[PDB]
């Protein structure tokens, strides 16, 4: 018999992104080919199968720095980190291959799906 | 020129609630008249003007235990904590006064608004 507030989830995500932009309560640095990205472990886990596995590990859950595979493109990661905190994906002809490869590595199934569809339309 | 995934914010909140239910990466205990509630500081801040003020304070941001005012009803808090992580509010004739008072103290403006409207309809 609950009532539901339609905009609640969007408002929560908007506030989490405001915290990220002001570097409030960020608890991890993600290192991508020397580029560094500060974030909230819980948000990373909520969006990515890879981060979910990493931060549920009894040893890795305590790390303040995570280094990604050197094949990962920092721009592709940045676009995906922005998507995690906003639901918006900056998908362009020039970045789609790097975004898809990064989403496959991060295990972000819905992003991989839209990249496959956009690539298939161009062939 | 971004594309947007409609269900992303809801899916993020659903995963954050799964983490809460398994007590994964919870970093604070909220004490309400001896009852204890584990939660994520970032989610509490994203939903409540009171928690936002508390955890942006340079001293309180580091506390692992927060004690609420003794006038706060634990059931009212529990219903609001559930709403924070799900967008669903269990509003009933028997709890509406405690829920509204708790939402006013926590500074959750949209919850206060629906409680005022439901109370006005019954008069």
């Amino acid at each position: 018999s609950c009532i539901q507030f339609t905009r609640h989830a969007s408002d929560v995500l908007l506030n989490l992104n405001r915290l990220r932009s002001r570097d409030i309560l960020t608890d991890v640095v993600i290192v991508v080919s020397r580029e560094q990205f500060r974030a909230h472990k819980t948000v990373l886990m909520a969006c990515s199968g890879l981060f979910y596995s990493i931060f549920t590990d009894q040893l890795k859950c305590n790390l303040s720095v995570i280094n990604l595979d050197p094949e990962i493109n920092p721009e592709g990661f940045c676009i995906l980190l922005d998507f995690m905190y906003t639901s918006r994906l900056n998908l362009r002809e020039g970045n789609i291959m790097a975004v898809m490869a990064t989403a496959m590595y991060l295990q972000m199934e819905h992003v991989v799906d839209t990249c496959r569809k956009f690539i298939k339309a161009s062939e | 020129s971004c594309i947007q995934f409609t269900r992303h914010a809801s899916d993020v909140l659903l995963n954050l609630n799964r983490l809460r239910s398994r007590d994964i990466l919870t970093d604070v205990v909220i004490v309400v008249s001896r009852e204890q509630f584990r939660a994520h500081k970032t989610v509490l801040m994203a939903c409540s003007g009171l928690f936002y003020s508390i955890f942006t304070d340079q001293l309180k941001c580091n506390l692992s235990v927060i004690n609420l005012d003794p006038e706060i009803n634990p059931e009212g808090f529990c219903i609001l904590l559930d709403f924070m992580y799900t967008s669903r509010l269990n509003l009933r004739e028997g709890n509406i006064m405690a829920v509204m008072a708790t939402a006013m103290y926590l500074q959750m403006e949209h919850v206060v608004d629906t409680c005022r409207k439901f109370i006005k309809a019954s008069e």
Binding site: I3, Q4, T6 | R88
Partner: peptide, 4 residues
């Protein structure tokens, strides 16, 4: 607010 809605009935979910």
């Amino acid at each position: 607010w809605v009935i979910p």
